[PDB]
Design a protein around this ligand. Structure first.
Ligand SMILES: *[C@@H]1O[C@H](CO)[C@@H](O[C@@H]2O[C@H](CO)[C@@H](O)[C@H](O)[C@H]2NC(C)=O)[C@H](O)[C@H]1NC(C)=O
Ligand SMILES: *[C@@H]1O[C@H](CO)[C@@H](O)[C@H](O)[C@H]1NC(C)=O
Ligand SMILES: *[C@@H]1O[C@H](CO)[C@@H](O)[C@H](O)[C@H]1NC(C)=O
Ligand SMILES: *[C@@H]1O[C@H](CO)[C@@H](O)[C@H](O)[C@H]1NC(C)=O
Ligand SMILES: *[C@@H]1O[C@H](CO)[C@@H](O)[C@H](O)[C@H]1NC(C)=O
Ligand SMILES: *[C@@H]1O[C@H](CO)[C@@H](O)[C@H](O)[C@H]1NC(C)=O
Lengths: 495, 497
């Protein structure tokens, strides 16, 4: 009918005579949102003849219906409810002002690094196709840690580990450093150009033009972090040679000094840089967020730096907060300031690779180091976020690539590695059979699924687009087909 | 304000008590009904003639007819050919009555590796003409009949593909291999080509996700795969070891089969009755043939294709839509055209047989190619009577007519005759910029089909109505695809896609 995806009709009529009602809606998960107007409920023309109105409240998560009249601005009913999808809820307001919100119809219902990379790629492809249009399979509106926020950081962690592993293997093979540097620069340049040309633009609307080309993005950031980490490791590389040896940390001390100074630079630039027409050290979403007194401030210092450097037209025109906070500005999640945190996370992946490689002959030592790093990073994350998605010093935020976000995802990745390394490598109980096929063809699978996003085996016309089940089935089938394609490529040894 | 290849025609009518209407038909139409271009009202008074503006096409020729609106009497007519961006003004006044056309502003318009080189040239020409070729009239497909440069890209590809099947299969058989595995590989390759075509090439996904009710089944790659399968299976079933008319006495079975198929095609085209349509029809319908048969595109071939596949599963914008104003759907890569495509692929197999049987002696190869080209040219001249629209079977791309096959095969034989000594015997030119697509045919074709809209091959234009911009963009895209083919060749990547 007239109900879109995840909406519930709200038939509302007033059993009163001398007040004009305007229903005001505000989703619960928002931190500080101005109550947007929803409908206008007039007075009943005669006694016993209420005037009905139709509303479509978003039922993704919660709702706070606030009602105070236009004439007097005095409350009549403010109630918090959680509507269901495709429901039919009737709000009866009457004298005793009292409201009940009756319900008409019930709403409807080594090998470990490779396995981990395959898991991250499969989840990324799933959430990129839409993830069944579920609110927990899409990027969270500003602060939040939905499932789609857990894919890219793990991929960067895995790439850091693989960078260190391959660098050590090549240096042990005996190749010179200049050839390695040339190769690293070439791969980074290729990744950047691929991201700028093939992945980021959408060519169905029309041809690419400089005035409307999106420079930063996923693959550009991936290549830049690749280049930075690989060059740093190639510069400060030492031959690989326990009981509290602490060699893996003290040997790579220049890397740690550089990473710490980079993190300090990110913290200072975010929390101290004076943004014109915006409070210094802003972390909010702008738009209607923070009670709506900051209309154009999305991203704070990072957003301002990105807009100044690349222009407001070369960024993402539909940021992840544009669906909830109604931000009218453009903000790329893969901006310029977040590259520092991405580099830090890739270096944490390098650290995991160092732990894996140094103590190759003692599994107990590897597990102890992994769990110690996981505990330390988890403690840092808990201290920073104050175990809350809104409060705390630095909230976990994907768009800003917050330091708490990096530390939390590093904790999760270290725990995942602590689980995966024994079973897949040491015990060999389960080789990650359905997963590592993209683990060996990451970049090819990503580029292919971006190019072939719209083709028949991955997309087809559905009976009703306003249904979660059909979208979920289509996305699952597409991801399974990409797993099968990666398997076929692996069998033919096309790397 | 003006479109591309469209002059501006201003009519100044000094007549007093006669409404004036004009008509226009392209000089390239065989029999086209005139269409209303513009209506010029009578002048309210002497000295202030009524002026009306209209845009006239320019791609090729123009014939105008001036008729009275009420009395339906012809006043005057012209055969002037306009310019791309002109300002021609037409004045008609009573003197009998004569109309003079004036120009206000002048227009502004002024292994063997020989098979590999052939296939590379055909592929590059195909990629150029698919991107548009500058929107030129002779770089696009012919309207219904005739032979433009864009019509020669595909038949040469099918010819060389057939020759390559023969060469590769005879090499494999000579080296030693079972026939069952070969037939299985051929079937897999044909099925893969058909599926690739249907899923990737034919449908456009930007307008929306694929819907089964509007899926175009026939197309270039499905036809390629079907003829590949048929000709490869025939030549594999009848394959004798290599050892003077010794290249036909060893091939008479498949020759008889090809003659049977050609006879079947001729019978179906010229004899199969069609409901509400003249038997043995070839005209484009619409306004062609004086508009007596509106929905009769292709005739027998169109009717058979529509009956077997349905109107929804066809090419909705055929080549004749722009000129002959037809509403029905006709797929150029239909079902009856597959017989002639098979015949041309078999002719390519015959050319490969000629090239292989006399590999030692080059004089014999050259005389064989000369004889084949001359015989096919004579057959084409007899069939088409040397005219675009006359003759028994005019050269037709959409129908894949027999004259089309004979003419394009004679041209392919002559091109092979020129290329073979140059690339092999004398070694003057080694196909340096062309044979990399000759090695990566299918990969390059599918890549350019998928990446047609991407930036290096297509970007926003400064002036969308300039031929120069489109030509530069298409040439740059084709050069980039040559470069990509060369890079793939250097990295030893080859025909696996
Ligand atoms: C313009 O007028 C001329 C003459 O009146 C038309 O020529 C004849 O048209 C009738 C029917 O309209 C045909 O039966 C004749 O065969 C035509 N030729 C002759 C010599 O009589 C002409 O058709 C008119 N233009 C258009 C577009 O209809
Ligand atoms: C309520 O609204 C109606 C029209 O919507 C208006 O005529 C009436 O005056 C309003 N009542 C008050 C008290 O403003
Ligand atoms: C409801 O009343 C509060 C004050 O208690 C006010 O801030 C708010 O704007 C009112 N809602 C409206 C006017 O929609
Ligand atoms: C919701 O319930 C009311 C109660 O009768 C009904 O009239 C209305 O049609 C229902 N909504 C829809 C969309 O059917
Ligand atoms: C020419 O067309 C005009 C416009 O309708 C009309 O008034 C006039 O009568 C026409 N001329 C003749 C001779 O009918
Ligand atoms: C054609 O000439 C007329 C009068 O000379 C002028 O008004 C008109 O703009 C010209 N059109 C073009 C396309 O030059």
């Amino acid at each position: 009918a007239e109900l879109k995806m995840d909406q519930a009709l709200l038939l509302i009529h007033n059993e009163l005579l001398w007040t004009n009602l305007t229903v005001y809606w505000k989703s619960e998960c928002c931190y500080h949102c101005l109550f947007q107007v929803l409908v206008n409920v007039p007075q009943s023309p005669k006694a016993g003849k209420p005037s009905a109105a139709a509303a479509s409240v978003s039922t993704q998560h919660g709702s706070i219906l606030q009602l105070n009249d236009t004439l007097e601005e005095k409350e009549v009913c403010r109630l918090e409810y959680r509507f269901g999808e495709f429901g039919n809820y009737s709000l009866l307001v009457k004298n005793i002002i009292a409201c009940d919100l009756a319900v008409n119809e019930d709403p409807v219902d080594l090998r470990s690094v490779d396995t981990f990379r395959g898991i991250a790629l499969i989840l990324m492809v799933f959430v990129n196709y839409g993830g069944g249009k579920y609110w927990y399979f899409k990027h969270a509106s500003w602060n939040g840690l939905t499932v789609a926020d857990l894919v890219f950081p793990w991929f960067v962690f895995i790439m850091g580990s693989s960078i260190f592993l391959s660098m050590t293997s090549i240096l042990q093979r005996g190749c010179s450093k200049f050839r390695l540097l040339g190769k690293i620069a070439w791969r980074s340049f290729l990744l950047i150009c691929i991201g700028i040309i093939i992945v980021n633009p959408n060519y169905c609307l029309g041809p690419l033009s400089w005035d409307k080309v999106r420079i930063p993005g996923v693959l550009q950031r991936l290549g830049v972090t690749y280049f930075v980490v690989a060059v740093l490791e190639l510069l400060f590389a030492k031959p690989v040679p326990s009981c509290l040896s602490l060699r893996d940390i003290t040997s790579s001390w220049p890397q740690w000094l550089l990473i710490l100074v980079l993190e300090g630079l990110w913290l200072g630039l975010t929390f101290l840089l004076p943004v014109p027409g915006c409070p210094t050290g802003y972390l909010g979403p702008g738009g209607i967020g923070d009670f709506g007194k900051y209309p154009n401030c999305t991203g704070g210092a990072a957003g301002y730096i990105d807009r100044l450097l690349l222009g407001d037209d070369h960024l993402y025109q539909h940021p992840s907060s544009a669906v909830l906070y109604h931000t009218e500005v453009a903000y790329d999640p893969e901006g310029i300031l977040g590259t520092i945190n991405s580099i830090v996370m890739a270096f944490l992946g390098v650290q995991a690779g160092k732990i894996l490689l140094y103590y190759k002959a003692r599994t107990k030592d590897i597990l102890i180091r992994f769990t110690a790093w996981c505990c330390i990073l988890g403690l840092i994350s808990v201290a920073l976020t104050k175990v809350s998605e809104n409060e705390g010093f630095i909230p976990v935020n994907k768009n800003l690539w917050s330091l708490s976000y990096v530390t939390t995802l590093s904790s999760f990745a270290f725990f995942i590695l602590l689980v995966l390394y024994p079973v897949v490598d040491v015990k060999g109980l389960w080789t990650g059979t359905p997963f590592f096929y993209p683990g060996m063809n990451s970049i090819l699978v990503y580029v292919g699924h971006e190019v072939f996003e719209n083709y028949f085996p991955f997309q087809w016309k559905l009976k009703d687009n306003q249904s979660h089940k059909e979208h979920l089935t289509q996305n699952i089938v597409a991801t399974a087909l990409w797993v099968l394609i990666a398997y076929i490529l692996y069998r033919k040894k096309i790397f």
